[PDB]
Amino acid sequence: MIGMAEVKLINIWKRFGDVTAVKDLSLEIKDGEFLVLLGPSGCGKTTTLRMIAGLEEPTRGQIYIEDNLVADPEKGVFVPPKERDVAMVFQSYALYPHMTVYDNIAFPLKLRKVPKQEIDKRVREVAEMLGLTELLNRKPRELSGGQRQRVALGRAIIRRPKVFLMDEPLSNLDAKLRVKMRAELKKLQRQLGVTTIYVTHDQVEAMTMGDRIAVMNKGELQQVGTPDEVYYKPVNTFVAGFIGSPPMNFLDATITDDGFLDFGEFKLKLLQDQFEVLEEENMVGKEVIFGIRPEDVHDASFTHIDVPEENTVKATVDIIENLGGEKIVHLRRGNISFTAKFPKESKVREGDEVSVVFDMKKIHIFRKDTEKAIF
Amino acid sequence: MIGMAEVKLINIWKRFGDVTAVKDLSLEIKDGEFLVLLGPSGCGKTTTLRMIAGLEEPTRGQIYIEDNLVADPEKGVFVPPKERDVAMVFQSYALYPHMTVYDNIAFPLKLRKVPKQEIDKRVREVAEMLGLTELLNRKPRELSGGQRQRVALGRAIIRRPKVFLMDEPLSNLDAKLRVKMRAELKKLQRQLGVTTIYVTHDQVEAMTMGDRIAVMNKGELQQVGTPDEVYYKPVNTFVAGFIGSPPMNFLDATITDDGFLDFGEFKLKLLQDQFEVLEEENMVGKEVIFGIRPEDVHDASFTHIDVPEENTVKATVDIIENLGGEKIVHLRRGNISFTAKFPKESKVREGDEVSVVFDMKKIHIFRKDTEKAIF
């Protein structure tokens, strides 16, 4: 539920001139979790990470690490990184070419006065965890692209801070290699049990590695939750449209006292409990934003959840994307447009009028004024 | 089947110094089809297109357009582009800023001595086909990104050649816009009925637009066929591994006199007709390359085509990619590695030992020596 947060930000703001990078941010990071700060370029995630590191001071607000105040500009509290016991690691820099794998990994500790024996012990442990034991005496130029990345990882997690901080450490990495590293990095984090805050703008990387994801946009926290929560239960239209591809469909609809969503060109029958939720919030008769992912709009010929006159709609095919393993079909019904996913064996052709089925178990309704989700 | 090819290349070669760009290429393009030349950077597709255009002369070989020889360096035949009646269009250049939409589209014809009246007629027809009629008197800076692309398309297909030639015309285009343009361009090509040869390195664009795709690698034609043929029936391992994502799995296996494929760590039962094909080619007892797409390797818990001891295998999960709408699972069994696609609702975790099912109806067997497909 919620015990003592390993890291806690309270009403944190960061301004650079007349530019607000981070706005009224409150967030609690759990001890031992792998927390990903996900958001588009310029959303304030890097600034947030640097403030937690102690490399930047907040403009206002408080930051705690295990209930110890490490930052509050109004109180003259700005604890240096070293005293916070949080380490910014895996930055974008090549392996030391004139150092062996052993020394590349040992360097961070050697610079921090760790006894030679302790260093040897810790370096070998890390090497074995990354399957580098037999490469210890090799020079960077003697390794393969994959091995080099593992040495860099070893060099990054050899330290034992209270919190690891990383900012897009796999940036521009070879696709195949990046996939292996995402798994490799998360495996180690779990093995070590050290709280990790990871910044990335790559949705797949976030969804793949994070125990939880903190989605940010324009300097504001949108939602924090598990990959499933941010994917299946987005709190607003930004999160709903930011996570998942192709993008979720958004359509205007009016709630009928009859238990239907009226889109004008057609109507869809709400499940009883969804209508119940809407009645309890007095939404009957109001226009809202309807959302459904393309994966939940099915070709009538390839589904058995169809309920005539309740979740089926006839529409015309305007675009067909052949992705090989599946087809992305852009449909149109009057002035309404929505996208669906059709199986690869579908013989649909552009111009065809087809019947699709909306899986009502997977829809979302957002308030049109605040765009926050009702569900 | 095969009547008179609209364009035909015979034993075509193109050398630049000691670099062979195109090697012994023979290809027939059908009248009225949209043929895509697909291949990785440097495969010779652009050189091939330029030779058909008449911008470059072959080093050797013959090129015909409707049974008329337009190129043969050994015979002193090098018909200029204009006399071939094939037009290279939609090159990468901005709309003319000081010209209206009307004139932007009319320019190609105005430069070619087409009567003012004919130009007006043809320009308006093209404008109506692209939904630009009401933008005819606007200047480029008055249009939206999407409209500008349609004007550029109009400027590209206003001419009436025997063959349209295009080289990655949607390069670096806005993703969403590129999807609409692929559909828009193919719609017009079909409307006009003009043979089109389109170069691209984007598999999805090729699969989406092409009536047929000519896959090339290192200057050599690998296969020519419909999107389904190149996807479901690759002639060799290059095509099999080049089209489709994630990449098809390739594993070494020995054919048993018992009708099984022995991978060492496990065995899979071949369907009778597949074994029959292998017996007829005397492959029993030989090692071959087995191929299966990840989409055809299923989580045992989410399939009913499982046949115990014949198409089921227990393996350990090494990597899980959470793509949101699905999970890409990298499995391992001994020293054997293969990837499968698991539904998003799967609760699989890394380290888990799970049972997967191989859909034998979708496999491929390639000769290990030539890597060509038996099926």
**Which residue, chain included where needed, has tokens 């589904």?**
A303
B250-254 own/partner pairs: CB under 8 Å, 24+ apart: B250/B289, B250/B290, B250/B291, B250/B366, B251/B289, B251/B290, B251/B291, B251/B336, B251/B338, B252/B287, B252/B288, B252/B289, B252/B290, B252/B368, B253/B287, B253/B288, B253/B289, B253/B290, B254/B285, B254/B286, B254/B287, B254/B288
Instruction: Quote the distance between the C-alpha of residue A156 and its chain's center.
Output: 22
Cα three-residue angle B282-B285-B289, rounded to 5 degrees: 90
Residues of A in Cβ contact (< 8 Å) with B227: 322, 324
CATH 2.40.50.100 fits A249-295+359-375, yes or no: yes
Q: Which residues contact B57 (CB under 8 A, 6 or more apart)?
A: B51, B71, B73, B78
- State the Cα–Cα distance between residues B313 and B315, nearest whole angstrom: 6
Distance CA B105, CA B360 (A): 53
Cα–Cα distance for residue pair B299/B182, rounded to 1 Å: 35
Domain B2-247 in this protein, CATH class: alpha beta
Residue type at position A134: E
Do the domains at B249-295+359-375 and B313-357 have one common CATH topology? yes
Tell me whether strands B212-217 and B34-38 are parallel, antiparallel or unpaired. parallel
Structure tokens at A280: 């309890």
Chain A hits for B323, CB-CB cut-off 8 Å, are 204, 207
Question: Would you call B323 and A204 a contact, using CB atoms and an 8 Å cutoff?
Answer: yes
Listed by start position, the domains of chain A span 2-247, 249-295+359-375, 313-357
Q: Which of A180, A293, A295 is opposite residue B319, by nearest beta carbon?
A: A180
Q: Which residues of B touch A325 (CB under 8 A)?
A: 244-245, 293, 295, 341
| Amino acid, single-letter form, for residue B7 | V
Which of B213, B319, B352, B362 would you mutate first to test chain A, the one with the most A CBs within 10 A? B319
**Tokens at A164, concatenated:** 């690891």
Determine the distance in angstroms separating the CA of A244 from the nearest CA of chain B, rounded to an integer: 6
By CB neighbour count within 10 A (0-12 exposed, 13-18 middle, 19+ buried), where does B166 fall?
Answer: buried
Give the H/E segment covering residue B138: none
**Cβ contact (<8 Å) for A321 and B203?**
no
Distances (CA, A) of A31 to A8, A28, A67, A194: 11, 10, 12, 8
Residue B76: left (phi > 0), alpha (psi -120 to 50), or beta? left
Q: Which residue in the block uniquely carries the two structure tokens 């180690």?
A: A188
Q: Which residues of B touch A203 (CB under 8 A)?
A: 324
The resolution in Å comes to: 2.1
Residue whose token pair is 């559909």:
B183
The runs of H, that is alpha helices, within A20-100 are 45-53, 81-84
Rounded to whole angstroms, how far apart are CA atoms B146 and B322? 33
How many angstroms separate the CA atoms of B292 and B357, rounded? 11
What is the spatial distance between Cα B189 and Cα B32, in angstroms, rounded to a whole number?
Answer: 9
Closest CA relative to residue B208, chosen from B17, B38, B79, B24: B38
Look at residue A101 and give its three-state secondary structure.
helix
- Chain A residue with minimal CA distance to B244? A324
Superfamily of structural domain B313-357: Nucleic acid-binding proteins (2.40.50.140)
Residue pointed to by tokens 């990655």: B168
